[PDB]
């Protein structure tokens with residue numbers, strides 16, 4: 049029915065949490081997993097991450113103890129999502145925001161915190177926690193150098209795990225009806241795993257809690273698991289640190305699973321492809337850990353995995369196939385790039401132009417009157433023409449006639465005004481996979497040497513694939 | 517409480533809709549608006565847009581009439597969000613997706629539909645609806661050329677407005693308790709405004725419904741309002757077309773408001789800044805139309821505005837200040853760029869280096885053993901040093917000591933391994949606003965002519981601002 053959103057909300061802070069739980073049946077059937085893999089889709093909060101909760105939570109504590117007055121400044125070291133949550137809380141309740149984040153993190157987090165009126169100081173990636181050039185040391189320096197400033201310190205504030213123990217874990221319990229067999233959850237500050245695992249083990253002691261730690265971090269138990277890539281920097285954002293945060297109670301977690309970059313990203317793309325959950329990379333790490341840890345489970349049992357982050361924060365980073373190819377990561381089992389590699393292979397546009405059958409595409413200087421160009425088009429019997437300057441684009445008779453009827457194309461007007469201006473350049477040595485990726489962004493694809501041989505669209509490639 | 521998400525969900529299709537309504541008090545107080553401006557945050561659906569609903573909806577109709585079997589292909593012309601919704605439905609229920617979208621639309625929509633296993637054919641921006649190079653004409657051609665393909669045709673399918681009449685309008689009614697005085701809603705295909713306005717006027721006849729149409733479109737009534745920029749292409753995505761779609765009942769809408777690009781984008785950024793709703797540009801258009809139309813309303817009355825789209829689809833486009841400066845759009849009344857322009861003005865780093873007070877920053881060839889570099893650092897009494905090749909980065913004694921303790925820095929190892937590798941180049945003629953924007957992405961900022969004068973961080977700029 050409708051209980052929680054059935055009224056009007058006072059601010060965006062009231063739209064945090066209350067996240068649905070979805071059964072990933074298709075993904076389980078893909079990976080050959082017998083049990084029910086439930087996903088807590090924390091990326092669907094108003095701010096698009098689980099950390100929103102603690103952001104809100106901490107401010108509430110700072111307000112329930114009277115420690116915070118209007119106009120104050122908030123400083124917080126973060127990998128990006130807590131900065132967003134605290135920035136939301138500050139823009140709503142009238143506080144000043146300063147974020148300290150490492151250079152490793154994405155630019156979308158930075159831009160979104162900038163739209164929320166927050167100052168952004170970035171710190172070097174390779175700095176240790178002890179360095180005063182660390183995000184935490186720089187935040188401490190800013191607290192020392194700024195008046196009416198406060199560091200809420202999500203690494204040591206009890207609100208961070210207390211709210212995952214109060215509401216989120218209670219959410220997971222009430223939607224799974226108490227029956228939980230495994231919980232796989234990423235270990236960043238460790239607040240989410242601590243709080244959720246504690247509440248669940250209190251209400252369901254037979255539940256195993258699995259912590260996910262990236263290869264490079266030192267949070268897993270024992271240290272014989274962390275020595276794969278000791279303190280080697282990784283790309284996944286959100287989990288793992290070079291120290292044990294104050295809120296992390298590693299004794300409440302039973303197992304530890306090590307997950308690397310390649311597995312995390314390919315499984316995140318698998319989640320998007322097979323379930324349709326616009327999810328982040330750390331959630332790929334958590335789901336890979338869950339698929340490895342819950343392999344021994346049976347049907348009927350429920351393994352709950354946290355999906356912390358939304359794709360919005362890594363929209364240019366790993367959603368783009370260009371960047372995952374530049375970082376040498378296997379795209380996915382079933383993906384568009386591998387599909388194009390399978391169908392096209394090494395076929396180049398030379399092969400298509402040869403199999404179809406003289407580069408006699410008419411050309412005009414792009415400032416002809418439309419009357420002269422239609423006379424040339426009717427005398428040459430071709431339908432399309434290419435306009436270029438001393439390249440401009442393509443121009444069809446259909447658009448000519450319809451825009452003359454529409455009141456957009458004058459008789460004495462230059463053909464530059466009505467030609468199609470979005471184009472993509474190619475050359476015969478190019479493969480067909482690359483022209484398909486180019487067709488993802490541009491309607492036409494034209495060749496050159498300046499002697500162009502023709503125009504290439506998606507239906508031409510479909511016809512070529514039909515000949516195979 | 518918890519009614520709708522209190523269980524486990526079968527797929528992401530069940531997480532569509534059920535969107536909360538938030539009162540934009542801060543934004544109303546900013547613009548000087550007396551009434552309650554309620555926002556239906558359709559961008560919080562699982563797919564991040566209102567169109568998810570109709571996407572789901574249409575498939576359901578196509579399944580309830582038995583017209584759709586497993587393995588079929590779905591073709592759909594879209595500005596991007598319906599393509600996403602239908603791609604979600606296809607990935608869940610096992611259908612093949614082909615999207616036809618104009619080149620005007622963002623690349624995030626394309627990439628996200630590619631991650632959902634959908635083929636993407638793009639069409640020219642300037643093409644009219646009649647052209648067979650139009651998104652609709654190309655979709656028709658693909659339907660003619662492909663077997664087991666179906667076009668659900670959101671422009672003419674009754675599911676599109678029927679579901680906004682069945683659930684979404686009923687949602688708005690049940691959360692506003694029947695009392696609605698104005699509804700401002702964007703006119704794209706017109707399905708959302710038709711359905712919602714019809715249901716609301718049926719349940720509350722005293723309600724005015726305001727349609728928003730971008731300057732360039734021909735959907736507003738009368739035509740004396742559309743002649744600002746007749747058929748001139750615009751940047752906002754989602755609303756307005758060169759024809760009246762089949763589902764648009766322009767007689768059920770009372771007013772029409774014309775909103776241009778500049779107003780839409782600056783108001784979208786204002787929404788993000790003042791309310792903290794990660795919202796899209798079309799929602800800026802709708803909110804600007806609402807602020808203009810509901811100006812005559814009183815406190816107590818409720819003006820409901822639709823927020824169709826999520827910022828995720830325009831993350832690189834208009835969230836980035838670079839692109840809004842390149843398109844000559846006023847950033848916002850209160851924004852970080854204008855704040856930096858106010859505090860810094862025309863001050864260049866020459867002025868800061870002069871006011872602070874000899875460019876004697878030590879340099880090393882970036883392959884010295886750490887022992888030699890620490891001896892040089894102790895003999896020069898400086899703390900930081902700059903490593904460069906035949907630029908590499910910066911290197912501090914704090915990181916030296918802590919990483920030697922950490923097991924990451926050998927005695928005979930080269931200083932390249934432990935130096936900070938993320939850097940930003942500047943030159944003395946650069947303004948301070950530009951170095952602040954650069955500091956949004958990089959921890960340090962160093963100058964050059966190759967003679968570097970020093971390193972610049974955020975605390976240095978804070979100190980300079982403290983001297984003013």
Ligand SMILES: C=C(NCc1c(COP(=O)(O)O)cnc(C)c1O)C(=O)O
Nearest residue numbers: 126127130236237238240286330356357
């Ligand atoms: C460390 C931070 N985030 C934690 C996090 C996590 C781990 O959540 P924890 O509450 O820190 O255990 C997983 N995924 C993402 C994307 C995350 O951002 C932060 O916001 O400073």
Ligand SMILES: C=C(NCc1c(COP(=O)(O)O)cnc(C)c1O)C(=O)O
Nearest residue numbers: 594595598704705706708754798824825
């Ligand atoms: C036209 C399409 N979207 C409609 C839309 C609208 C208008 O919604 P309509 O249901 O078409 O009236 C507003 N904002 C955005 C971002 C939109 O995408 C489409 O998905 O093809």
